[PDB]
Amino acid sequence: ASPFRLASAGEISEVQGILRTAGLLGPEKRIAYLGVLDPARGAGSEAEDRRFRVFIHDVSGARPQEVTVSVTNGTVISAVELDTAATGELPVLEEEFEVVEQLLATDERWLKALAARNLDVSKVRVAPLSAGVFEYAEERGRRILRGLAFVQDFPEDSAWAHPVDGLVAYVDVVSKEVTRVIDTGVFPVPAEHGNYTDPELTGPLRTTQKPISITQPEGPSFTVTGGNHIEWEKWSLDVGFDVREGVVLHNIAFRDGDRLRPIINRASIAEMVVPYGDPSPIRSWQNYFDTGEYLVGQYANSLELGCDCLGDITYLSPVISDAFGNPREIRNGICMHEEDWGILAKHSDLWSGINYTRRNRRMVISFFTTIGNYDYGFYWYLYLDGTIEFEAKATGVVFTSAFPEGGSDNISQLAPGLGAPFHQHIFSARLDMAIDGFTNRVEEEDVVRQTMGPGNERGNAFSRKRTVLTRESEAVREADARTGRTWIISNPESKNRLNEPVGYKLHAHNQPTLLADPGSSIARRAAFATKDLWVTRYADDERYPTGDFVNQHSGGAGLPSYIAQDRDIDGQDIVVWHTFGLTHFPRVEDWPIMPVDTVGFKLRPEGFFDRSPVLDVPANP
């Protein structure tokens, strides 16, 4: 069967068994990451070796281990002890989140700070947040979470409406010690509630919305075979799932007549970073890498039919490992369906008398994740005409603070006394390209303005220019919306019928990239987010733009170290890393629950096909 098939409960139980038998999974051990490894480049002699990569944490303080396991042969391949003070800590465990509030509740410094605010400790929730790397030398080599407090007036109250500003604590979650409690002063706790299901806030619900029924009376046009292989309207792909990256698309290819033509070997969101722009000591450390530090797949929602996914939905229910190696199913974690997408092509020709209209549609593959106050949707779209699009949907409840009485240059006021610090949500798409095969190159395409003069006497001409990126050292590129800058991924050895190299064009949204000072800690750890486009030469171990162990790593790992190798990328197996993000200055309308905002990118064919690939679409029924 397919080596790209989803992990099954049996494979995960068998990994647990192999590890136990090898002496690697005793009672002090916890699995912080488990995922299948992709087949090797040809080296994997077809056959089949289902290999799994495991990060094992030790709750007694011993060194963690990276282990690779073969479940086909039931053996441990390698087990390396990690020096986390050098190469970074493991991802946060779910059980460590719950520990922060409990420890703080019995710490004299925390209780004193709460008493000075006349707050009941049984009503104070603590958001446990990743720690980053700053000036505290005692944290190097230690698993640290930081806590910010919110008041919950009653169990169904939205705590985010009641931030306790001026207060932050740092917690060692392995030795279970409170290392620091910082109290810069008392701020009023905002009193208005933010309960968006309370009739007192919502008013009477609308009665004016009539139903929209979307049905497919003959079922959907896509087929699913082998659990996760999709065929739809000439597209072919495998839908993977990884506890860290979430949904991963493999082997995206398009059937152009008789031949299956590869386009993208692997597509994923390989990292995301959420940096905050509030210089207050209470929050100036606040950054999370939701993918690399928390593992966004682990927090995927079960998606409800008619609510989260409307229409004729096919579901995938991926299996991940819990902290002890037992399989855990995310029921209805992935939604797949096709959607009408308006007009595809249209022309009414006067001379021929032919009127022609065809409708477009797209395949949708999506999942949603929730981490704390944030909710992120990840949407991959495939269109009839060969376009591939990614869209992130950001929603949830904004992270709050007090609003200072004299105003602020870095915080929005949402309600009396209630602030929302400025922040970004930045994503890194990793696109292991395979445009008609693995010999690919990237060109930067700019519009070129021409001057009125000889050969252009009316001053109307304009053109474009393409610059080939030949080595990694020249392949760190910035957007330029004003010159219409795009990037083309082409195959110099595969030509269309016009004898031009086949290609795909990447259209970015040209949003601002990382705003932090280039000397900041976050600029070093999130270096990928400072540029719009990176191209690297493929390597099996270069998976994430931040490195493998993002939690509490000092920085520089990942992309800036990969590109220092200065490898040849001109007609080679290459990987495109695209940074794109939202800059969020929260508005009153984002409160008390925020409407979705979106960002993404798209790839459109650029002389990939010999003519329009949608000539054979029939007239609408």
Place this chain on the structure above:
Amino acid sequence: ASPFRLASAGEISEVQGILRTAGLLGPEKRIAYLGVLDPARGAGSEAEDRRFRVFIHDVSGARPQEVTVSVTNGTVISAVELDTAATGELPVLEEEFEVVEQLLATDERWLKALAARNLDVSKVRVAPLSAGVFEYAEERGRRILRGLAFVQDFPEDSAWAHPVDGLVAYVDVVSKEVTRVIDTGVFPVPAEHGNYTDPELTGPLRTTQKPISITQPEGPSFTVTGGNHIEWEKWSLDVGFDVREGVVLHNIAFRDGDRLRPIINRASIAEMVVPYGDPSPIRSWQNYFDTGEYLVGQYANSLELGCDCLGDITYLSPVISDAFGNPREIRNGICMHEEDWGILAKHSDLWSGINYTRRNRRMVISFFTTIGNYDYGFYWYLYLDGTIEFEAKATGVVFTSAFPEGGSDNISQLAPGLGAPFHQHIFSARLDMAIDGFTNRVEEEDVVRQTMGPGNERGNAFSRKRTVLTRESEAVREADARTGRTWIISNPESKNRLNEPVGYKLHAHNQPTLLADPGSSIARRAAFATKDLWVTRYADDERYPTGDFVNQHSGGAGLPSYIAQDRDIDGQDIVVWHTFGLTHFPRVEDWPIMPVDTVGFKLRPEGFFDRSPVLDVPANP
């Protein structure tokens, strides 16, 4: 009844009668433009005076006239003779398009050019195109069209596949004279056909697409009263139609509790320009202003249910005048429906245990127009959360040329010997703002990066800055995607509950603007297209960014002359003019019929509301 109601067949017949009785519409006269005038600013003492503006052409060569007519009182208000050599020619008449091919067919120079190419004149179609203003002094004061030739091998053949390059003719359509025929040389006529309904090209049609049924079992959630007044999900607006601008939105307002709050007084696409970037003498003159020169509303398609508009559709059938003053109905010219739009807001809260999901939807108002080879869709979207969005969809058949044998820097090759010149499609949105009333101002908002240092020791802070545009002379603005530049329209005298001015934010796509040399003819006539944003003080006669008479006008009219008045726009009745466009380097995939590409803009509330306006949306049925 509403003074914003659509013109009726009776009103148009009555305009015809008034003009006839006044001696203004005899047999030598033709109506080149007819449209209702909007109610005056308060000055219109409610009551009702339905006034119509008429451009009357004279086919005997006498001077044309601008006439304003009151159909309520059955009188002519004013009739002015136009000096078209000074102020521009009238819009092209449909009957003048048909004249170009007929005249050329009996001209010895044209027949000689066709004979030298072994072409049969009965198979040569001539695209009649607007002329612009260049070096030919004989054209000043004359109605000129230029013709480019295409070969049609048989009546149902797509002529666009067979351009006759090296040949162009100029025609005086009033005296019916061929002024010039230019033959720069013989080019092979591309032989491959481009017939996208021919089974030989399409192959067997797909059988894999299963139906998508979109129904509203209880009917739609919007109501239509008075012919064209829409109420939908707290939105209120009137849908107008103008033969020049096409669909016009009036009185866009949102019901926020008890009060109806204005947002936009009038929204339209007030001009569009399609400049070509090929420096060949055969085409370097090629620019059209489809709105101002051709009148895009006049060429609106009748939209077929299930093909052009899918779902539960409500139709409007606008009435326009033909060239003699008879009413002509565009049946099913406007489609209106609501569409599901995925998730609106979502949060699963761990501390409260509440899981919350709400679905979004949008109201869609659209029309399609066809001029020659081009087909343009105009889409206005209203969303539950207060967002307003415009989207243009460009499709049709690309305008073609020969592909030169040595290559070209300004033309794409689509097929053997077949070129497609580079061009842009640029739109001007005119937004007569009324944010909570008519005292509005515009601010330019830029992201501000901050340096690591005192008060920002971790180097994470970032902020933003808003610059008020106080006079027209400072209100010609350029995009800056890198600093996240947007524009806020606010009402300094209307505050939200946080005592901040209410506002709306304009989010542009930041595509390139007009690429032509600033000294070119098109840069002067399409000056609006050289900048992303203009703000003017409202005036009843400042309707179009190019002026009233765009056909063969020398330039400088419209926006650059309006803003020279340097009026106060700080808390005044203002109008926002946003330029946005597509730069089209045609691809092989655009041939032989092109998939839709899109561009547009959106406005999102920015502290307009006191909290999220969609708290009262119910859970999905």
